[PDB]
Amino acid sequence: MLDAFSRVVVTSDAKAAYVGGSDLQSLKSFINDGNKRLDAVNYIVSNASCIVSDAVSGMICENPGLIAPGGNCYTNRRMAACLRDGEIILRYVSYALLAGDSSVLDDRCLNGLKETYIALGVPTASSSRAVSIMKATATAFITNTASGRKVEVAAGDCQALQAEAASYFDKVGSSID
Amino acid sequence: MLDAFSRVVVTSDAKAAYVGGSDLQSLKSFINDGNKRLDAVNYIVSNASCIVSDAVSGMICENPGLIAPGGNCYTNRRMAACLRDGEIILRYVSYALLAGDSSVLDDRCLNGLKETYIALGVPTASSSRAVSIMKATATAFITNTASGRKVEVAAGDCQALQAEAASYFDKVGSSID
Amino acid sequence: MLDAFSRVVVTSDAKAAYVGGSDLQSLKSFINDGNKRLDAVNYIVSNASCIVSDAVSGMICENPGLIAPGGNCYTNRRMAACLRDGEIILRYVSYALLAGDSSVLDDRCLNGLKETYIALGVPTASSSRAVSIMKATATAFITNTASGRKVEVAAGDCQALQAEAASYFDKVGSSID
Amino acid sequence: MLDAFSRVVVTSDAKAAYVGGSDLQSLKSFINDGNKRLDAVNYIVSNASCIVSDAVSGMICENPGLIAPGGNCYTNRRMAACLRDGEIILRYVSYALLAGDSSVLDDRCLNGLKETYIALGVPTASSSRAVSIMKATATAFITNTASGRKVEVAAGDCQALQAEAASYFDKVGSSID
Amino acid sequence: MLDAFSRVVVTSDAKAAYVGGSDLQSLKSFINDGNKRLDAVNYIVSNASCIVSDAVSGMICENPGLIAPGGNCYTNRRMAACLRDGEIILRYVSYALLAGDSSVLDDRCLNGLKETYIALGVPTASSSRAVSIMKATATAFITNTASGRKVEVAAGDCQALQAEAASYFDKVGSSID
Amino acid sequence: MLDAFSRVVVTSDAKAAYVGGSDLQSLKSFINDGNKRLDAVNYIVSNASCIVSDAVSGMICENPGLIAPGGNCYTNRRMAACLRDGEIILRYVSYALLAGDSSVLDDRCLNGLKETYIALGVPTASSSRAVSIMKATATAFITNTASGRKVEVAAGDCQALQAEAASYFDKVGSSID
Amino acid sequence: MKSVITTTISAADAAGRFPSSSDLESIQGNIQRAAARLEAAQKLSGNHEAVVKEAGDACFAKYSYLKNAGEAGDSPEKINKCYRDIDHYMRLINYSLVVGGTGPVDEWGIAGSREVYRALNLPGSAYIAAFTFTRDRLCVPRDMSSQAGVEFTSALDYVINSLC
Amino acid sequence: MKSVITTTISAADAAGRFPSSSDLESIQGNIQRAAARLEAAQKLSGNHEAVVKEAGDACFAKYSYLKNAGEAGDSPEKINKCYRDIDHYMRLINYSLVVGGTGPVDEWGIAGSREVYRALNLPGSAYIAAFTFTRDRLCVPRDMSSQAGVEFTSALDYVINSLC
Amino acid sequence: MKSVITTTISAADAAGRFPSSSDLESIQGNIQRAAARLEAAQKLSGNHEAVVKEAGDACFAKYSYLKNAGEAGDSPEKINKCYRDIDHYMRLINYSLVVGGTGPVDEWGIAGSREVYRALNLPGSAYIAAFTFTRDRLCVPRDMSSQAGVEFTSALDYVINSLC
Amino acid sequence: MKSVITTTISAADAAGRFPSSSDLESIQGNIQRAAARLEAAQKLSGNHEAVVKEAGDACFAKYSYLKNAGEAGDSPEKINKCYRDIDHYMRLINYSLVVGGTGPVDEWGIAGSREVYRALNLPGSAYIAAFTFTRDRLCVPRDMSSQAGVEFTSALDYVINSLC
Amino acid sequence: MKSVITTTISAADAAGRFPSSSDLESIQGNIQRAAARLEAAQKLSGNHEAVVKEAGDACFAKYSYLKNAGEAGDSPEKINKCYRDIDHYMRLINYSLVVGGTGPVDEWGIAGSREVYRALNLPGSAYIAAFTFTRDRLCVPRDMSSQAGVEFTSALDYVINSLC
Amino acid sequence: MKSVITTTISAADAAGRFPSSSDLESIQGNIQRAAARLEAAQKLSGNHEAVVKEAGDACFAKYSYLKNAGEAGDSPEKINKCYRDIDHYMRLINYSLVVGGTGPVDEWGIAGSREVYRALNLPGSAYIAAFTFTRDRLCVPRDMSSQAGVEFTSALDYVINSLC
C-alpha cells in the first residue's frame, strides 16, 4: 500500500525525478496538519460502533424490506454479516484517512467488492446508503458538529480533512454501485 | 443440505409462516411411509455393485467405441474412473432417496458435473445412458421386480418411492446432457 | 511428460498397434545419435549464464525503453525477474532437447505463459526477441561455431540437433507472441 | 470411540467369542432403559450453562486466590478459558453418558489433560473441585432433585444412570488430580 | 542419501584428501561388477511379492499366536499392515543393494523403526524372523539357487553380492531386535 | 513480547497496583534518554555486516579447527549458516536494545537455542566467543569508540546504554554455554 | 439444516459411504419421535400470537427499565420489534421441532445473534426472560402431551443456553 | 466403531456441540431396531458352526478348482483356514448386528482385506460364494423373524459388496 | 503487549529485518507523546478510588434493576465485585496509558470478556454506563491537561467500543 | 511416462536445475540398453498373435471353471475379451520395452486394474496364469537373445507382481 | 512501501483492528522526524549530479581495473551506466528519506540486485566504494544539519549493508 | 548426494516403487561413463598442487588489485586462503567426478557460497578467473583422454555458472 508520501514518490519515479521543491511543499503541509489528521482519525475510531450501527440501522429504517423474509438483512446471521461489512468499510476508510491516500482501501477492500456483492446477492444500492450515512456521521465527528457528542479540542479549520474523509466514503460508494 | 422436512421449513420461512395444518400433512405421510423408504434405500445399497457394473457394462455393450483406442473407457484407469463415477452417482441418489429431497444430489454431486465432463472430454450422452440403466435397475429393486433377485418383505404399494427414485436419476441425467 | 520414445508409443496406441518396423527405425537413429544429443545438451547448459545474460542484454540494447522509467526491465527486481524467465525458458528448451520432444516445454513452461505475460504487462514482443537471441547463441554452441568459444569434440554433422533445438526456441517464441 | 455395545464386542473379540446369551442381557437392559438415558442426557444439556457457571463460580468462592493477581482465573481471558474447559468436560461427560461408555471421554478429553494443565500451570486441585460441583449438579438434575429446577417426568428409578454419570465425573477428577 | 561412490567421497573429505589410487580401485571393482549387481536387484524385485508373502506367512506358521485374537497379525487390517511393512523393508534393502550402501535403508527406513514398533506393540522378535526369511529368499534368488524358480544367466560368482544383501537384512534385524 | 514499559506494567499487575510515582520515574528516564537509545541502535544496525563478519572471522582465526574438515564452519554451507546465526543474534539484541527489555531476545531467539546447537553439534563454546566479539564491537560502536569508524554526534554519556547492550550479549552467551 | 437425516447423510458422505444399517436405524428415530415434536410444533403454530404476547409482557414486566429513554424498548416501534423477535424465535422453534433438529434456529436465529444484540444494545437477559417465562408457563397435559412438552421445553432450553 | 451412537457423537464433537434433539432422536432408532438385529445376532451366535460349515461346503462345491495343487485350498490346513475365515466374518457380522453399525466388520474384516487376499491368492469370488449361499439359504420365519432376517441379509449384502 | 515498540519490532522480526529508519522514527512518537499519556496515567493512579466509586455509583443509579433478586448486583458481595471490576479496567487503562498501546487492556480485560459476561449474566451496558460516565465527567484542565485528557478519553472510548 | 529420460528430467525440474552430468550419464544407460529391449519389443510385435493365443489357451486350460455359467469366460464374447486383454497387456509390454520404463503399462494397464477386475469379477490368478505361462515359455536363444529375454522377463514379472 | 504509516496500518489490518493509540503515536514520530529527513532529501535533489559524479569518480579511482577489457567499465557506455546506477541509488535514497522508510530502495533498488550484478558481472565492492565515499564525504554542518546528516548517513549505510 | 544412483532411487522412493527397468538402465549409464570421469578424477588427484598453483597465479595476475590494502588478498595469509579455496573446489570437482553427479560440489562448495563471499568481500570474478583459466588450459590428449577432458570441462563450467 502507499501513503501520502510514497504516492508522491511513485509519481516522481515515473519521471525518474528526485523529489524536491513543489513536491516537498504539499508533504510539509501534510506534516504541518498532522495533528489535525490524528484527531480526525481518533474521532472516527472512537465512535466506530456508533457510526456503523446507526448507518446499518438507518439503511434498514429507510428500506424495511431488508428485514422481511428474503431480505439481505433477514436472520441474525445476515444482520451480523452486514454490521461486520459496515465496520470493515469504516476500518479501511480510517486507514485511508490515517495514510492520506486511498491505496489501502482500493487494494485491500474495494478490490472486487462489487463482484462479491453481486455474487452474494447483497444489495449494492442499500450498501451505498449505509456508506453514505457513515459518511455523514464521520464527517460530523471530524468537524465536531455531531448532534449527540461534542469533545474538547483546539478550535481550527478541519474542512480539508473532512472533505478528504468524505472522498474516501464516496470512493467506496462509487465502486459498489 | 435439506431433507423433506427442512424443504418444507425453507418454503414456510419465505412467507414467515409457522409450519402447520396442510404442511404437516405431507410430512406425516412421509413419516407414515418411512419404513417403505428405508427398504427402498436398503434395496439400492444392497445391490449397489450389481447396479453400477451392469449399467457401466451396459453403456459399453451399446457403444463399443467407448473401449476402442481413444474411447473414454479405454485403459483400466478410465474404466476404473467411470465405474467410480457410476458408484458416486448412485450413492448421491441413495442419499436423496433417504432424505426425501434432491438437495444433497444437486449441491454435492450435480453441482458442476456437466462442466467437469465437458472439460475432461467425458461423453455426456454415454453418461446419461449409464444413469438411465441404473435407474431401470434401481426402480426394479425398489419394487422387488428385479429379474435376478427377489426378497422377502411385507407386500405393499411402493409406486411413489420408485417414481421418486426415478425422478432423482432423471435429474442427474438432465443436468449431465 | 513424453520423450522421443513415448511420443512414438502414444501415436501407436491411438491405432492399438504394437511398435515395430518403421517405428523402431527412427528410434534407433535417436539412439545412434545419442552421444551427439548429449553433447548438444552439454553445450547449452555449460554456457547457460552466457546465453541468458547476452540475450536479455541484447533485448535491452535494441529496445532501451525497457530500462526507462515504466519499462518492464526497470528496477533490479524486474531485471532479476526477466533474467530468471530467460533462464527458465532455456532450462525447459534444454529439457526438450534432452528428451527429443517438446512435451515438457509445452506442458510445464509454455502452458499459459502468454496469458501470464499479458496479465503482468510483460512485453511479449520483447520476450520473443530475447528468445530468438538465445536461439542464435544456443544453435551456435551446438555446432561449435560460437564466436567466443570453441571446444574439442569429434567432428561430425550436428545439423539435425541444431535445427531441433531451433524448433524448440521457435515454439516458445510463437506461443508467446 | 466405543459405546456400550461395541465395548461388549471388543471384550468378546478378545476371546474370538460371538456375542450371545448373558452378554446380550446386559445390552438388552441398556435398550430397556434407553428412554431414561435419553432424559438423563437431556437434563444435563438443558442445564449446561447453569451447571458450568455454578461450578466454576463455586470453585472460585471457595478459593478466592484463583481470582487474585497471579491466580489462574485472573483476567477475563483466563476466566473465559476456565469456563470453556468446564463446558468441554461436561460436554464429553454428556457424550459418555449418551454412549454408555467412557471411551470418548478417555480418548478425546482426558488423554493428556493433566500434562496440559501441569504445563500451563492450571491448578489441578481446583479443577477437581470444579468437576466435583458439576458432578453434584449433573447428578442432581438426572434424578430431578435439583433445588432451583424441577421437570415433569414419568416417575421411576434412575439411580444407575446417576451413578454411571457420577463415575464419569469421578474419572475426570482422578485423571486430573 | 549416499551410494558406494559418495560413501568413499565422505570418507576422503574427512581428511581433505582427493580420491585416487587405492580408493578408486574399490570403486572400479564396483563398476566392473555393475552388471551382476543389476541382476541381483532385478532378481529381488522380480520376485518381490513371493519373497514378502512367504516370509510373513513363514513368520505366522512358526508363531500362530500372531493370528490368534490379540495377536499382532489378527484382523485383515493388521495382516495388511504387516505385509506392507515387509514390502517396505524389502524395497529399502533393494535400494541399498542397488546403491551399494546402506545409507538409504538407515535414514529412510530403520531410523526410528524400533521406536515405532515398541509404541504400536508390534512384536520386534517376530519382525526379525520375517526379515530373516526374506533374507533367506532374497539371497537364494541372487545366487539363482531358489528352489521354485531358476533363471537363465551368464554363469559367474555373485557371492559378494549375496553377502552384501545379507548384511542389509541383518542390519534391519539388529536395529529392530 | 514486552518492552521497558510493559515490563513495569507486568510487575505492577502482580500486585494489582497502578503504575505511578517511583515506577514512572524509571520510565520517564527512558523517554528522556530516548534519543541516545535510538542512536545506539542505529550504530549497531548501520554496522551490522561489519560486526557480524568480524566476530565470525575472529571466532575462526582463534580456533582454526572450525574450518578444518569436520569443523563446524567447514564448507560454504556451514560458514553461511554461522554467519546467518551471527546476524540473527545481533538482530535480536538490537531489538532488545530498542525495546529496553530482553523479552524478544529470550522468547524468540534464546528459548531453545542451546538445545538446537547441541543437537546439530554446533560448538557452543565457539558460539559464545563469536557473541563476545560482537559484544566488543557493538559496545564500541554505541560509545563511538570503534577504531575504524567514528561518527558525528552530540557529545554525552551513553554508558548505561553500552552496559544494557552488553548485558543482552552476555545473556546470549550464558544461555548458549 | 441439522437433523437426524442430514447428520447421518453428511457423515456417510464425508466417508464416501452408501447409507448403511446405522444410517437407516438412526432415521427410525425420526419415525418414532416425530409424533411428539410435530404435536408441539402444531400447538405452537396454532397459538403463537398468544404465547408471544405473554412472553413479551413477561419480559417487560420484569425489565421495565427497557422502557427508559435510550434503552431497547424506549418507543412503541422498539417494543413491537421485541415481540416480533420473540415471534421469530418461536417460529424458528416450530421449524426446529418440525425438522427434529436445531438447524433452523441455529442458522436463522442463533448464528450472529451475539454480534447483533451487542451492536444494537439488546440485553440477552430480556430474551432469556421471555423464553424462561414461556418454558415455565407450559402446562402438561393442559397445553400438550408429556412428550410434546419435553420437546417444546428442550427447544426452549436450547435457545436459552445460546444466550448464556 | 461406526454405530448410530458413535456417528451422532462424532458429528456433535466435530462441531463442539452438546448432544441436542436430533442426537437424542437418532438413539431412539437404536431402542426401536435393537430387537430385530439382536435376534439375528442371537440366532447366528447359537448356530454359527452349522452356518459356517454350509457356507464353506458351498464354496468348495462351486469352486472345486480350489483344491488343485497351488490353489487356496490345496491342503487340509488351507481348507480349514477357509472355513475359519468364513467363521470370522460371521462373528464380525454378529458383532455388527449387536453394535447396530458396520464398524466391527469394517475395521476387523473389510479393512486391508483386498491387500491380504491379493497377496495370499485368495479369490474374492470364493468368499462371495460362501456369503451369497448363506444369504439365500436364510428362511423366514423358520430361521428368525422377518425383520431379524432383513438385518441378517443386509449385513451379508454389505460384506458381499465389499468384495466386488 | 501491543505498543509502538512491540508493533514495530514484530513487523521487523516477521520480515527478518534489523530495525531501520521507520522503526526508529516510530519510537520518536513515544518520546513525543509519553508526556500526555503518562500524566493521564499519573492522575488516574492517584485518584482511582474516587473515580471508581463515582463510575460504580453512576452505573447502579442508572440501572437500579441490578439490585433486584437474581441480577448482577443482588447482594453486597456482587455490588463490591462490580466496583472491583470497574477498578480493574481503570488499572488496565492506567497500564495502557503507561505502555502507549492497548495491549494491557486487550489481553487482560477485553479478551474473553464477552464469554465471561455472558456466562455470569453481567450486562455490558452496566459497564458501558460506568465508562461513559467517567469519560464525560472528565474536566480539562481541572483534572489534567488537554492532551492527557484526550489520551484518557481515547482509552475509555476504546473500552466502551469493546462492549458494543 | 516413466522412463530414464522423464525420471531424470522430472528430478531436475523439481529442483529447478539444468540437466547436469548425472542426467546426461543416466541417458547413456538408454543408449547401451536400448538394443536389448528393442529386440524384445520387436520379437513381441512380430509374433504377438501367437504369444497371446498360447497365453490365453494356457489360462483356460488351467482354469476351465471360467467357462462355467456366471464366470468370466461363460460365453464366446467373454473369452474373446480375455484374449483381447492379454493382447492389450502384451501391447503395453511392447510399449514399455520401447520406452525403456514401465510408464505405459503403469498408466494404461495397471492403474485402476484392481478396481475394474474386482467390479467385473475377473480373477487376477487367470491373468497371472497367462503371464506366468508366457514368461516360462520363453526360450533363449531360440526366441531372442539373452539380454532381450531378461528384458522381456522383467516386464512380465513386473506385470505379474502388479496383480499380487 | 515500508514507512511508519504503512507498517502501522499493515499491523492493524492483519489483526483486523481500527487504528488505536499506538498507531496514532507512531505517526507522531513522522511529524517530529520529517524535518530532518526532508532536509537531507532536498539537499540530495538539489546537488545530486555533483554527488553522483564524485561517487562515480571515487569508484573508478579505486578500481581502475574496471576499465580493463571485459570488465564492468571497459567502454564509455558501460561507465555511463555505472554513474547512472549510482544516480538511481541516490534517487531511491531521496525517495526513502521522503517516505521516511526503506521501502523505495528496498523494492526498486535492492530487491533482485544480487541476481542482476552476479549475472552482469557487476562487482558489489564498486557500488560499496561509491556509497562509502559519498557517506564519508558528508560534511556537517557544511552540507546539511546534524540530524539531516544522520538520516543521509543511515540511508547510505543501509544500502551499503545490502551489498554485504 | 546427487548422482545417477541417488536420483533414481529418490524418484522411486517418492513413488513407493521397487527399482524397475528404467532404474536399472540408468545405472548402466554409470558403468559406461565411469571410465572417463574416474580418469579425470585420477589426473586431478595426482596433479592438483600444480593445477591449483596455476589457477591461483592466473587469478592474481588478472586481478592484481586484490593485493591492495583492504582487498581479499591484502596479506600473505589471505593469498594462501585463496589458493586453498581453489584447492577445495578442485577437491570437490574430484569428488563430483568420482560420484558422477554434482552432489559434492553442490553441498560442500556451492551452497551458501554467495552469502559467504558477499560477507567476506571475495569477488566471484576472481574464482571465475581461476576456473576459466584451469578449463582453457586443459590440453587433450596431453593431460587426459578426450572424454575425461569433456567431463573435467563440464565440471568446471558447472562451477563457473554457479558464480554468475
DSSP characters over H78-103: HHHHHHHHHHHHHHHHHHHHHHTSSH
Write the single-letter amino acid at D29.
S
Which residues are CB-neighbours of I52 under 8 A, at least 6 positions away?
A: I83, I86, I87, I90
Nearest Cα residue in chain G from B5: G99
Give the CATH H-level superfamily of domain J1-164. Answer: Phycocyanins (1.10.490.20)
Instruction: Please count the CA atoms within 13 angstroms of the CA of F30 that sit on its side-chain side.
Output: 26
Write the single-letter amino acid at K55.
A
- Write phi, then psi, for K141 (nearest 5 degrees): -90, 15
The reply to whether residue D49 touches residue I112, judged by beta carbons under 8 angstroms, is no
Option in H22, H32, H158 nearest G2 (CB): H22
Task: Give whole-number Cα distances, G3 to A162, B5, F20, G21, in Å.
Answer: 53, 9, 59, 18
Nearest Cα residue in chain B from A67: B16
Q: How far apart are CA I153 and CA B13, in angstroms?
A: 46
A145 grid coordinates: 458538529
Write the single-letter amino acid at C157.
D
Nearest Cα residue in chain E from J141: E152
Distance from CA of E13 to the nearest CA of F (A): 7
Interface of H with J (CB under 8 A): 63-65, 114, 118-119, 121, 123-125, 163-164
Which residues are CB-neighbours of H164 under 8 A, at least 6 positions away?
A: B49, B53, H124, H128, J118, J119, J121
DSSP of chain C? ---HHHHHHHHHHTTT----THHHHHHHHHHHTHHHHHHHHHHHHHTHHHHHHHHHHHHHHH-GGGGSTT-TT-SHHHHHHHHHHHHHHHHHHHHHHHHTSSHHHIIIIITTHHHHHHHHT--HHHHHHHHHHHHHHHHHHHTT--TT----------HHHHHHHHHHHHHHHHHH-
Q: Are F165 and F142 in contact (CB under 8 A)?
A: yes
Write the single-letter amino acid at E15.
K
Nearest in space to F91 (alpha carbons), one of F104, F79, F101, F81? F104
Name every chain A residue with its beta carbon within 8 A of the beta carbon of K23.
98
Interface of C with K (CB under 8 A): 49, 52-53, 57, 75-81, 83-84
Q: How far apart are CA G72 and CA G85, in angstroms?
A: 12
C95 grid coordinates: 529439457
| Whether the bond into G141 is cis, omega within 30 of 0 | yes
Indicate contact of D with J: 3+ CB pairs under 8 A: no
Distance from CA of K72 to the nearest CA of A (A): 24
* Helices F48-62 + K146-162 axis angle, to 10: 50
- Matching residue, cell 574427512: E14
SS3 state at K72: coil
The reply to whether residue B77 touches residue J119, judged by beta carbons under 8 angstroms, is no
The response to whether H82 counts as a known ligand-binding position is yes
L24 grid coordinates: 536399472
User: How many residue pairs bridge chain A and chain G with CB atoms within 8 Å of each other?
Assistant: 34
- Matching residue, cell 490368534: E68
| Whether the bond into K76 is cis, omega within 30 of 0 | no
Q: What value, to the nearest 5°, has the Cα angle with vertex K9 and ends K3 and K11?
A: 100
Q: How far apart are CA I130 and CA I106, in angstroms?
A: 18
G41 grid coordinates: 410444533
Q: How far apart are CA B9 and CA G111, in angstroms?
A: 17
User: Which residue of C39, C49, C94, C144 is the best one to mutate when testing the L interface, meaning the one whose CB has the most L CBs within 10 A?
Assistant: C49
What residue ranges do the domains of chain J occupy? Answer: 1-164
Instruction: Please count the CA atoms within 13 angstroms of the CA of D67 that sit on its side-chain side.
Output: 16
Q: Are K41 and A42 in contact (CB under 8 A)?
A: no
A78 grid coordinates: 445476515
Nearest Cα residue in chain G from B40: G24
The reply to whether residue J63 touches residue H65, judged by beta carbons under 8 angstroms, is yes
Name every chain H residue with its beta carbon within 8 A of the beta carbon of E79.
112, 116
Q: How far apart are CA B151 and CA F121, in angstroms?
A: 72
E64 grid coordinates: 500362530
The enclosing H or E element of E139 equals helix E124-142
I115 grid coordinates: 464469554
Q: Are H121 and H112 in contact (CB under 8 A)?
A: no
The reply to whether residue J22 touches residue L11, judged by beta carbons under 8 angstroms, is no
Write the single-letter amino acid at C6.
S
| Whether the bond into H141 is cis, omega within 30 of 0 | yes
Whether the CB of E69 is below 8 Å from some CB of chain D: the reply is: yes
F82 grid coordinates: 554461522
Dihedral sign from CA coordinates of I109, I114, I116, I122: positive
Secondary-structure percent of chain F, ordered helix, strand, coil, rounded to 5: 75, 0, 25
- Matching residue, cell 598442487: L49
G87 grid coordinates: 415471534
Q: How far apart are CA F72 and CA F118, in angstroms?
A: 12
Whether the CB of A20 is below 8 Å from some CB of chain B: the reply is: no
Q: What value, to the nearest 5°, has the Cα angle with vertex D113 and ends D112 and D114?
A: 95
Nearest in space to D4 (alpha carbons), one of D95, D85, D88, D82? D95
Instruction: Map out the domains of chain A with their CATH numbers.
Output: 1-177 (1.10.490.20)
The response to whether B78 counts as a known ligand-binding position is yes
Residue L140 backbone class (left: φ over 0; alpha: ψ -120 to 50; beta: rest): beta
Q: Are J89 and J131 in contact (CB under 8 A)?
A: yes
Nearest in space to I19 (alpha carbons), one of I32, I31, I10, I29? I10
Q: How far apart are CA D54 and CA D57, in angstroms?
A: 5
Whether the CB of B16 is below 8 Å from some CB of chain A: the reply is: yes
The reply to whether residue E81 touches residue H120, judged by beta carbons under 8 angstroms, is no
Name every chain L residue with its beta carbon within 8 A of the beta carbon of C47.
157
Distance from CA of K22 to the nearest CA of C (A): 33
Q: How far apart are CA F142 and CA F44, in angstroms?
A: 7
Q: How far apart are CA L34 and CA F109, in angstroms?
A: 48
Which residues are CB-neighbours of A156 under 8 A, at least 6 positions away?
A: A36
Dihedral sign from CA coordinates of E23, E28, E31, E32: negative
The reply to whether residue B6 touches residue G18, judged by beta carbons under 8 angstroms, is no
Nearest Cα residue in chain K from L122: K125
Q: Are A93 and A169 in contact (CB under 8 A)?
A: yes
Name every chain D residue with its beta carbon within 8 A of the beta carbon of E69.
13-16
Q: How far apart are CA J24 and CA J20, in angstroms?
A: 6
Biggest alpha carbon–alpha carbon distance for chain K = 60
Local structure of residue F112 (DSSP, 8 states): T
The enclosing H or E element of K81 equals helix K76-99
The reply to whether residue H121 touches residue J123, judged by beta carbons under 8 angstroms, is no
Interface of L with J (CB under 8 A): 2-4, 7-8, 10-11, 20-23, 25-33, 37, 96, 100-102, 151, 154-155, 158
- Matching residue, cell 432383513: H150
Q: How far apart are CA D73 and CA D85, in angstroms?
A: 12
Q: Are L154 and J21 in contact (CB under 8 A)?
A: yes
The reply to whether residue H146 touches residue B152, judged by beta carbons under 8 angstroms, is yes
Q: Which chains touch J (3 or more CB pairs under 8 A)?
A: B, C, E, H, L
Nearest in space to E46 (alpha carbons), one of J108, A112, J135, H137? J135
- Matching residue, cell 484517512: A97
User: Which method, experimentally, gave rise to this model?
Assistant: X-ray
Write the single-letter amino acid at F115.
E
Cα H152 to the center of its chain, rounded Å: 8
Whether the CB of E160 is below 8 Å from some CB of chain D: the reply is: no
Other residues' Cβ atoms within 10 Å of the Cβ of residue J27:
28
The reply to whether residue E98 touches residue L9, judged by beta carbons under 8 angstroms, is yes
Write the single-letter amino acid at J98.
V
D44 grid coordinates: 444435563
Burial class for J4, CB neighbours closer than 10 Å (0-12, 13-18, 19+): buried
Q: What value, to the nearest 5°, has the Cα angle with vertex J83 and ends J78 and J84?
A: 90
Nearest in space to E52 (alpha carbons), one of E76, E15, E88? E88
Q: What value, to the nearest 5°, has the Cα angle with vertex I8 and ends I2 and I9?
A: 95
User: How many residue pairs bridge chain I and chain K with CB atoms within 8 Å of each other?
Assistant: 94
Q: How far apart are CA B41 and CA B51, in angstroms?
A: 13
Q: Are G110 and A76 in contact (CB under 8 A)?
A: yes
The response to whether C91 counts as a known ligand-binding position is no
Q: Which chains touch B (3 or more CB pairs under 8 A)?
A: A, C, G, H, J
Secondary-structure percent of chain H, ordered helix, strand, coil, rounded to 5: 75, 0, 25
B119 grid coordinates: 472439460
Q: Are J30 and C34 in contact (CB under 8 A)?
A: yes
Q: Are J126 and J86 in contact (CB under 8 A)?
A: no
| Whether the bond into L141 is cis, omega within 30 of 0 | yes
The reply to whether residue G161 touches residue D49, judged by beta carbons under 8 angstroms, is yes
The reply to whether residue B83 touches residue J110, judged by beta carbons under 8 angstroms, is no
Convert chain B into a string of H (helix), E (strand) and C (coil).
CCCHHHHHHHHHHCCCCCCCCHHHHHHHHHHHCHHHHHHHHHHHHHCHHHHHHHHHHHHHHHCHHHHCCCCCCCCHHHHHHHHHHHHHHHHHHHHHHHHCCCHHHHHHHHCCHHHHHHHHCCCHHHHHHHHHHHHHHHHHHHCCCCCCCCCCCCCCCCHHHHHHHHHHHHHHHHHHC
J150 grid coordinates: 531378461
Q: Which chains touch D (3 or more CB pairs under 8 A)?
A: E, F, G, H, I
Option in H140, H157, H164 nearest B46 (CB): H157
Nearest in space to I38 (alpha carbons), one of I50, I30, I47? I30
Which residues are CB-neighbours of E110 under 8 A, at least 6 positions away?
A: E171, E172, E175, E176
The response to whether C109 counts as a known ligand-binding position is no
Q: How far apart are CA L91 and CA D55, in angstroms?
A: 73
- Matching residue, cell 526379525: E128
B174 grid coordinates: 438432465
Other residues' Cβ atoms within 10 Å of the Cβ of residue D119:
9
